[model samples]
Target: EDLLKNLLTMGVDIDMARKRQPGVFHRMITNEQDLKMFLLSKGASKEVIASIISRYPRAITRTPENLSKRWDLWRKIVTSDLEIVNILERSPESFFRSNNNLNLENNIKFLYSVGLTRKCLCRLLTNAPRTFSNSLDLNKQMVEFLQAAGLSLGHNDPADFVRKIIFKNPAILIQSTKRVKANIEFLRSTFNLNSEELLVLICGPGAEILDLSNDYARRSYANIKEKLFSLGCTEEEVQKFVLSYPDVIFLAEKKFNDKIDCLMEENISISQIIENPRVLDSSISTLKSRIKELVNAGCNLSTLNITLLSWSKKRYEAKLKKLS
Candidate 1:
């Protein structure tokens, strides 16, 4: 009990510790110090060492031989010092997951088979550290669907393009293709968009829409259309706004309503916002601060554009000072 409690304090969930390498706990009583030294020699800081044990407590209990075996497995996938340390730090579970190497190996091979570049894979795994948590089938299926939807993961594909589609919504892999297609069809029929528009929406800013369930995305889109109409946007204006900022569909109802309320409070016309719906990307607090600061500076809100969101606070203050 005492030995397990210590592992718990180190960050390993008790339930998981039991499920994976439970016997290792009995062995850890004597060998914990050895593992500690081994991890440190591998460039893990003291803090990272503690985190590694917490995130993947089973690893701390691996015997020297077990550790060496796992080390060889990790080296097969990501050998660079920085990437190894990064993976260990960000997703140590990657090291301890059952058949970790085989899972990673299969996942990587599938990505490469489709022509994804090493750079693309690195960025994808780094951005979405838990990319391998899903089964290889689900991961491959998602990528294949995206390929058919106009995303090319082939050698000719731009690294930026791969990064944009995959990294942006790695949950995309876990999501059912049925739900993704439903969202696309909903957008298509609801707005009367053509195939090109639908592809751009799914593969671009709207990729996260796939994260929603089929029912939720449909209801949410309907609710957003109604909310926009109430906010004084015409049907055509709403269509243009949705095409330009399909991400708005993912925002919660409260967030959308509160932002519209904030816009009305600031006397920003509905048309002004719909014309540049990218403004919707800013949080209500950010919009409020920028609007308030602009009002204080006697700048016209009607002419203010999305560039205001890019300015640092210091820039805002400096410009305010100059104007004053």
Candidate 2:
């Protein structure tokens, strides 16, 4: 009765919490009160705490001692306790998913031993919290594979290579090394990139594509090649265009086709697009709006510099003002 009254006072939806974790209600030693007090001490509002408990009643099962220890470990990477509280409030599952504080501590140490910076660790904790739940050997295996992959790719500083890749894709540790390997191999073979070119690509924008499914990457690359070739681009031109802005392969087939059609319809030639492939990064709506604005201002769409399509909003507005 006291627990029900407390939950009601705190605005917890008793039915929602009970439905989510029926066993939690049956446990005689649950810690809902302790959990609420602990989170309150950490700056979480009563509503946020209640909502977290509502979403994941299993949160009430965490002991006060375990919670304190876990918070301290998280604080080591996340400088502020309030930030940790915010992260938990946003994704309570990230903290409550596993209660093994030892595993969290060991994972942090192992990642550091493998040369991940505090900044990188912070990114992991924020964006890829599941990485902390991964077993020590699992994390070690991925790191070892990354080191070997870097050496084979002719990177002299494999540690640096691993760090850059992780910085670009923090969730990469949770991905299977086999998938990463397949993506790397597909990119190298498809682009016919030598060791140096491949290294630059991986450390550059290409890092974001490493975790893509192999079939999707292959299909997307094929579509890009076909579309470019049909537009009178030579095989060599297609390769050069993609290498210049590898992110183009990230677009689905129809989105790529629609963007190309839209640009050509606006008198932007295929050669100009190939030269300024980053323009493809902008959405069709953004492109249409910018083109209309520029055209209305007496700028000739056929001859104007096209790189402005991808400029920041402030820079684009400043250019627009200049043209007027």
Candidate 3:
């Protein structure tokens, strides 16, 4: 009755919490008050605490001592308790999904030991909080796999390679090493990348693609290659184009084709696009609007610098103003 009244007074939806974790409500020993006070002390409002518990009822199971220890461990990576409070308010499940504080401690320690900086740990904590809950052995396996893969790819410093990959993709540790390995292999075979070339790709913009499914990466690259070839790009040109900006692999076949078609229809040459592949990062609408504005300002589309298509609004507007 006390717990029910307190939860109600705090504006927590009792039915929602009960539905999410029915067993938590049935337990005789719970720490609703302690949890509420702990979060309130950490700068979370009463309303935020109620919402967190309403979404993740298991939060009440965390004792004050456990919460304090877990928070301090998180503080080692994160800057402030308020930041953690905000993260919990936004994603309570990330903080309260698991009650194993020791796993969190070891994961942080191991990640730090593997050359991950506090900034990298902060990113993992904020963006991929589940990383902290992964067992030390599981995390170690992925790190080792990355190191071995980097060494095999001719990276002089495997630790730096691992750090770069994780910095680029915070959730890489959560992905299966098999999936990563397959993506690496697919990139190597599909692009005919030698060790030095593959190392550059993996360390640069290619890191983001490593977490994509093997089949998706392969299919997307195939679609890109086929489409480019049909549009008069040589096989060599296509390889260089994709290697220069591997992010193009993230686009689906139709989207990639549509972007190319849009640019070509606007009088932008295929050669210009291949030379400035990053312009493909802009959406069709953005391209159309910017091109329309640039043309209105009396700029020639064909011979003009196409990289302006992907420039930030401030930069584009300043250039547009100068052109006018």
Candidate 4:
């Protein structure tokens, strides 16, 4: 029981329990030659850099060097590169070697393509409005840019999904269902509810970012206070909380899943296990090989999937219970 609970807890809260692997910057380069040049300056061995360059020659064509090099800040670029090098050097060759020899460039590309570079550019320039001053026009332009860059589309729902998660807690969002129907029971829901969760339920759901409007978004979460009464709960110990409906969920599936997996993997990290003194007399010198041996003997991926899926449902079902 102890072992299983430890493992499950580690799996559930892994993102909060351990250090995150620093970001991978290689694929961000897009262009292999440009990447090789940067790697050379970062102190990567020429032979190693060349080997990677040789593998992703065509990916170089997609380089938006114009925007990348001249984007809002240059000094920030220099500092980020050095930080990149420091991170890359510590990564095991296994991270790249098998990737290269096995034509796993697709996996590598997806792994590093976290939209980090573009997002940083937006932040550097304040990711706010650009050139236009008319509030309406600026809003339109901003939405266009976000759409063009595939921000919301690339990510999942923004309603339920939020960053900066608190370990061992739930995530929630607030919504205004008046958007879906002017006759919404806003007073009932808006007057009572707990919005302390990391992710909250919203009242109105919609395709647009506006606070509320229309029947299509009727299922959206909007009235935070009404949720308390709607869900048959009450609280006198709080004031001014976020209200969310049943369907307003966040689209951070991949990020959340990866974060969870990383934590568990690190907790059971081969390095730490090797030092456990559990197999002190064994000939094994490292956890890497030992893990592989166990894996080879018999690994059941489906079992892990089932357990993981159940956890995912529980994480989201809190909203189902609150909203439905």
TM-scores, all candidates, are 0.75, 0.87, 0.87, 0.23
- Show the colliding residue pairs in model 1: none
**Tens-digit lDDT string for candidate 4 (166-221):** 01111111122233124223323434433322112222221222333343323332
Candidate 3: stretches off by over 4 Å: 1-26, 252-254
Q: In model 3, what lDDT does residue 122 have?
A: 95
Candidate 4 is scored at a TM of 0.23
lDDT (CA) for every model shown?
0.68, 0.89, 0.88, 0.30
Q: Give the winner by lDDT.
A: 2
lDDT of 3 at 157: 90
Candidate 2, TM-score vs. the true structure?
0.87
Cand. 3 Cα-lDDT: 0.88
Tell me the tens digit of each residue's lDDT in model 2 across 55-98: 99899889999999999999899999888877887788879978
- Model 1 segments beyond 4 Å from truth? 5-35, 60-82, 147-164, 167-171, 213-216, 300-322
Q: Residue-wise lDDT of candidate 1 within 7-34, one digit each (tens)?
A: 5444546665466555666662545556
